[PDB]
Symmetry: C4
Subunit: 387 residues, 4 copies
């Protein structure tokens, strides 16, 4: 058992090979599958797991009623092996949580689960399943975190939390954590920026996070930092806008793009020099479809030209959240940190006539060998018996 | 593999961070979840488990009928990982039992399961799943035990059993067990005291148990003892009365408080010098709500002043049994024994219009970092289909 | 990993402590539990398992129809941890079989599964899940075996198979097996004897089997032998008759007792010198109830006096097959081979108005500490929804 | 952990002993069992697993509708232990796939899963669950592979893929793979031959594959090759025609037998010098029955004489695909590579009046001890509730 180094660069990639699909909603029409949202993937040196926030209910049961609701005392962070359906019969219990993160440092799992009231929520940190720290709301307004993996470098792991308005200026903090204990934190000095639900990854010993501006940006904000929490901030400049909703692609901005900027969806992007791999919905206005775009000057350049598009989910199918996950050389035997991603395929409310809201998932890993675009949607037939 | 020392002191704590929630009843509306009551938590050096007394039936099935009944030949002691629902598909079989205790000495699990007739019940002791001892009823009147974890120090584990009336003077014995063999027992000389369902924990090489007086006390009795079974006895003095039912808080007594003293609920408290952390229901008359109170002179003082109250379950929600569990330094890496606790959330009979009685659980661990009060109730919608 | 020695004596025992109960039929009213019969228990140096013959169907499903039928191409030998319900989600696949045995030699599991047609059935032997040998029917008339554990001594394991009439003289062979290969066999020269479904155990390096005479005996036949297959044969002499059906107890015989001698039930007994522990039904005529009787001269003496009776299942409850299993000193750390037993609690046809037949189980281990009689019956409420 | 040698010869065998039966369809009438087709078996040095292509749905649920369809984005390659039903609660996720192969080199599992559109499908190769390579369609017409195990020799594993028409000349390639990376491939020069769904096994350091001609052959084509991919090609000469459909047995051909040659079923055969063990359906026109035939000159001789026939599934019962699998000396301790085989028992469409298509399985291993013919069919009663 050895700590992940995290000092190699992100592997450069030409396209995305399909890695998993769980078919959760299809299966849960009969089987005992949790109602879940906010799923994400994270890997140890030996395996990759799907983490998710349950609603303490199963699909096609009456207790799935009203699961559009985000925060309750019933929600729990749990995990299962990647590509398996999240069931009570195969899921590890992690934490009581309505917002979460998790990541493996090479030795043990760090889990962060936030529960409690909106006006004083508390993040519970566990290392190897034992409580190691807590941190309470500092603005008394829905303390919340990534909904995807934290990122680890040489025994220290890193995340971002937000507290404050989801429709205005809020407060954003970066944390360094070692063996589940917070050792350092800093508040980002980011007036006029908005950060939610960061997708953070390690690359050459430093952390890069691509987040969601829910206030006034249809491009994605980013924050990057070293192990000392010395940070930089910006927005992705590309006119290939990354949030949902958004406008049609046009000349972008290196600050927040106000057009269609309110509200958003969790997402991710991978930075390679001045270029970027952008994952986004296909629809500008709704959580439909998914695609990967390689824009070789899109981190810093404002044009709407790009070089590669790969289809992931068709424009007439439901998509949802997405996030980064990485596979370190300790797991793969490669000489670089492999980028992967997942997509949550959200079914039910508000778009469909059900009593419930739940998701399934798909995931892909970056390669330099041949790939293909297609559509790998959820596939369940709604409504269900319970509806 | 090394025996737990049990020689450090209980960690002082300022509040309780949420540790687990299983949502058993909500899930069992559809999933295959045991009807259970008398759950408890206990940990090895490697993991924490939920133990429970099944009724040999599943939720929402006809065999759940009449499960208000306490003792039958179908009841079994089983266990699963903490925070997972108790199912036939994830639960380990421990013993045939309608009353139980269990605890890990650092090397193997000790389980104690009592079955047989009311007039001659027998406790079957297992160490690593192999029968190692038995002990038969000595008063021929429902031999019974903790319904929570036993306590271990340097290779010896300790428990309390009762035999006799539940509504008058009974007989109470303390046992020392090594590798699942009873090596010593003493009968407590406690005229006018009543002991049921003890919550026992180790602290500085000695055992403290806080129990239920079902005869004539609305405060909780205690017994504490060393490894040689040299004991002391008393009642918690605080006017913050700990049992349910009880009177409104007023001046307490260091002997049994007769007002509303008959009947009771299993509970716990943690002694720190002259102070006590009291877990109790919020209602004085019914098993509703739950709260933690820090009363810095409440072990020996009779006033009803306290310093800290932390809400756990709201006053309008069902609660039930509660108990201590500990995490030893061998599990945590700390230099003290960490106090935790669980609460059983009882659903169904007698208070609700069902054919069945079952519970879910929540648990918390003591910390000195920030925490918050809230309500984490059961959340199932009764009655069920079967009712 | 070391071979079981099997050279110590059977531990002497004063009574029987309850060890497991699975509640299979009760649970299977809702859960996904196999229709099974012919269950048995067997242990390795690390764990004990329940083996059983499925009918390739679940309880409360239409495919449970007609499971009174003994032999089909759907029946499989499977196993699960002792006291858990036999489900597709927790059961290991062992062999395709409508008659079986299994036992652990200290290194790996031997399983013997007989399938094929009545006129040419083939026993498939597996060691560690790999086919190691076969043996085909030699009388072309339902080759069949123990339905309980084989017995192992110093790397060799032993069983008995029968081929021929179940209502007349048949042929009975003893086998020595090493690493799943038959190394020696002998045909028992037993004119006028009938052997079915032997319960065999090791004791002081030699094997003792107590079996079922289905032709003309209401006492039980026995065969004993050393590792070279040098055997002796007899019947239990006690007037405490061991088979079901049987007459009322009276003066017995050291040969087959013809009164009520046709038909029978699988059972067991443990020999201690001239004495015997007899497990039997409570009813003389039907598979109802169960009890343990210690008769200190019953192996060789024909009187109907006995010293100890312990109740196991009440006379108004359904019982069924029973069998021996042992726990070797390699598992327990004792200096003797511990006797245990199981009882199959058969529900459904022919006695009850269902489409199906299935069982649950209970088990006990012998001790010298205090025990108690009670009734631990199946407890399911028949008929079921499917009926 | 050591690479399989693969250098011993195939064990000569006189008959087939039954190894497994899962009863998947019978069980899935109630239990949570995947709709599957294209199952196969493959073994490591420690265990044997059943691999299968799920339809992302469970039996007796509405999402099983339309599962006659071969390729969709919901199909996944998963695996479970041999003889267990494929459930979400016991199955390991392997790959997103509508055509597959897998095999263990002695160190880790290689899985090959093909997904994407018909005009540009991509095979994703994983080694120990990590993507290690991809290969894209080279004829843009349903890139596809074995549906049974690949074959490994001294750290290299070997498979065959096809791209092009299923009813005319297509393109066939052989691949050598090391640690999940393609290191060599060659296109077979096989004008007028047709290769689909190869069953490939190792024998004396070389690979023999027996496949399906779906274009114009009712005998089976074969390809054999060394580690350098130097190959030979032919058709099985025996007048005991191996495909389904086929004509009645008559004089065969060493090239494709045109009579009833169009269409086909996946199958296998084992070469021993000039002789062959042929597994085939009993019906010439439909997927019914199964039998093993030993034809001692059938690899190169055109007569329809044979020496041994062993029944496996009766002529009036449904069969389906079949394939080889092997057990290497590293698993068995033998001095030769043991041949086994599986049979898929297909239920539902097109032959039966259901909304769905799924299968169960049986498997057998070759021995030289006594065996017997019988019928071990699927046994489910169709239609189901959902139909
Ligand atoms: C859970 O357990 C409860 C309690 O047993 C059970 O409710 C009971 O159901 C039974 C059957 O419906 C009821 O018993 C009947 O009561 C009526 C009077 O209300 C009697 O007339 C009936 O007797 C007649 O019918 C019998 C059968 O034909 C004859 O044997 C008899 O001589 C009479 O002709 C019968 O006793 C009982 O009233 C209820 N009790 C309640 C609701 O309190 C409940 O159904 C169980 N639920 C499940 C899911 O298992
Ligand atoms: C499995 O899949 C099959 C195939 O889809 C499915 O069977 C089909 O069910 C549908 C719904 O019952 C049927 O479609 C209907 O067909 C009738 C004629 O027979 C039409 O009149 C119907 O159209 C009217 O109703 C619609 C809804 O109100 C309107 O949109 C429409 O304009 C019309 O007013 C409708 O098309 C179809 O006939 C069957 N096909 C069969 C049986 O072959 C089956 O139910 C599925 N089963 C499960 C369990 O999923
Ligand atoms: C990865 O993290 C490890 C921590 O496990 C880093 O190693 C540590 O580096 C620090 C800073 O130089 C060392 O601190 C030193 O402490 C000693 C006394 O204990 C003092 O004499 C020195 O002046 C200094 O302050 C620490 O010893 C060292 N520990 C170990 C176990 O190596 C490591 O440098 C990090 N690697 C990278 C590439 O960032
Ligand atoms: C338990 O079984 C073991 C087998 O693993 C027994 O040990 C074996 O005993 C036999 C018989 O005496 C020995 O056979 C000898 O073979 C050698 C040549 O290999 C020959 O020179 C001798 O004349 C004799 O025939 C065998 O060596 C021996 N093997 C081992 C590994 O010990 C053991 O005796 C059994 N124990 C009991 C208590 O029954
Ligand atoms: C990335 O981190 C690794 C692991 O610490 C570094 O490799 C070690 O470097 C030191 C000093 O050169 C050696 O003593 C160790 O033996 C190396 N370990 C291994 C496993 O190779 C490596 O230098 C770093 N890579 C960079 C900066 O590119
Ligand atoms: C608690 O028990 C521990 C463990 O036995 C004691 O530590 C051991 O005691 C002596 C030192 O006094 C040494 O021989 C051992 O090496 C110690 N073991 C370890 C693991 O440190 C310890 O002294 C006791 N604690 C207190 C507070 O008295
Ligand atoms: C039962 O078998 C055991 C295990 O083989 C015997 O114990 C061994 O005996 C030999 C010869 O005396 C010693 O060399 C070994 O060291 C012993 N092993 C152990 C683990 O003690 C034992 O003698 C036999 N018991 C009898 C006959 O009562
Ligand atoms: C099959 O391969 C095995 C394993 O590599 C060969 O055995 C090895 O080869 C030589 C002996 O000729 C030794 O260097 C190794 O120690 C052998 N290993 C083992 C485990 O025995 C073997 O020669 C080959 N078999 C045949 C039939 O050619
Ligand atoms: C803007 C980010 C936060 C602010 C509280 O809100 C999130 C949005 C979503 P969304 O998918 O956009 O809602 C439809 C669902 C998430 N659980 C919710 N986070 C929590 C903690 O409530
Ligand atoms: C007072 C202590 C004992 C005396 C026998 O009784 C207990 C009380 C309850 P309670 O939750 O208070 O009942 C509603 C449930 C328990 N299983 C029951 N223990 C057994 C062994 O029967
Ligand atoms: C006499 C022993 C044999 C002769 C074939 O028969 C057994 C009897 C019973 P029983 O419980 O008595 O039937 C109600 C069920 C068993 N499976 C059956 N063994 C097989 C292989 O068929
Ligand atoms: C001829 C070989 C291929 C050509 C595409 O077709 C296969 C045939 C069948 P079959 O069982 O014969 O259909 C009833 C089921 C298979 N999944 C299907 N392979 C895929 C990849 O589609
Ligand atoms: C869903 O919840 C609402 C609010 O409690 C309730 O009134 C309604 O009946 C529920 N609907 C279903 C279908 O369960
Ligand atoms: C702990 O137990 C051992 C017996 O194994 C004994 O020797 C030792 O003195 C005990 N230690 C303490 C601190 O009581
Ligand atoms: C049971 O099986 C018989 C014989 O096939 C059949 O005719 C009958 O309808 C079945 N009954 C039920 C309740 O499934
Ligand atoms: C097996 O592979 C190794 C490469 O690791 C090679 O050195 C060796 O010569 C090969 N052995 C045979 C028998 O082909
Ligand atoms: Ca936005
Ligand atoms: Ca650009
Ligand atoms: Ca009281
Ligand atoms: Ca006070
Ligand atoms: Ca008889
Ligand atoms: Ca006698
Ligand atoms: Ca053909
Ligand atoms: Ca021939």
């Amino acid at each position: 058992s050895v700590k992940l180094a995290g000092n190699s660069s992100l592997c450069p990639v030409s396209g995305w090979a399909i890695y998993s699909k769980d078919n959760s909603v299809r299966i849960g029409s009969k089987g005992d599958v949790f109602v879940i949202r906010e799923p994400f993937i994270s890997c140890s040196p030996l395996e990759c797991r799907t983490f998710f926030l349950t609603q303490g209910a199963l699909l096609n049961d009456k207790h799935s009623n009203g699961t559009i609701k985000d925060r309750s005392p019933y929600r729990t962070l749990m995990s299962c092996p990647i590509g398996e359906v999240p069931s009570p019969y195969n899921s590890r219990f992690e934490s009581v949580a309505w917002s979460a993160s998790a990541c493996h440092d090479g030795i043990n799992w760090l889990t962060i689960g936030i529960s409690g009231p909106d006006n004083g929520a508390v993040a519970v940190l566990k290392y190897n399943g034992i409580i190691t720290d807590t941190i309470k709301s500092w603005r008394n307004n829905i303390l919340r975190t990534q909904e995807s993996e934290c990122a680890c470098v040489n025994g220290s792991c890193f995340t971002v939390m937000t507290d404050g308005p989801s429709n205005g200026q809020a407060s954003y903090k970066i944390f360094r954590i070692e063996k589940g204990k917070i050792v350092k934190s800093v508040e980002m000095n980011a007036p006029n920026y908005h950060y939610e639900e960061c997708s953070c990854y390690p690359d050459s010993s430093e952390i890069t996070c691509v987040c969601r501006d829910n206030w006034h940006g249809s491009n994605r904000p980013w924050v990057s930092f070293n192990q000392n929490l010395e940070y930089q901030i910006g927005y992705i400049c590309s006119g290939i806008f990354g949030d949902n909703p958004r406008p049609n692609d046009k000349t972008g901005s290196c600050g927040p793009v106000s057009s269609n900027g309110a509200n958003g969806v969790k997402g991710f992007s991978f930075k390679y020099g001045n270029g970027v791999w952008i994952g986004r919905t296909k629809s500008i206005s709704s959580r439909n479809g998914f695609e990967m775009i390689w824009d070789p000057n899109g981190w810093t350049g404002t044009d709407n030209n790009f070089s590669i598009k790969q289809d992931i989910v068709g424009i007439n199918e439901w998509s949802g959240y997405s996030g980064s996950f990485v596979q370190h050389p300790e797991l793969t035997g490669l000489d670089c940190i492999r980028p992967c991603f997942w997509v949550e395929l959200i079914r039910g409310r508000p778009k469909e006539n059900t009593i419930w809201t739940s998701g399934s998932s798909i995931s892909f890993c970056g390669v330099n060998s041949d790939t293909v675009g297609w559509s790998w949607p959820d596939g369940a037939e709604l409504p269900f018996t319970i509806d």
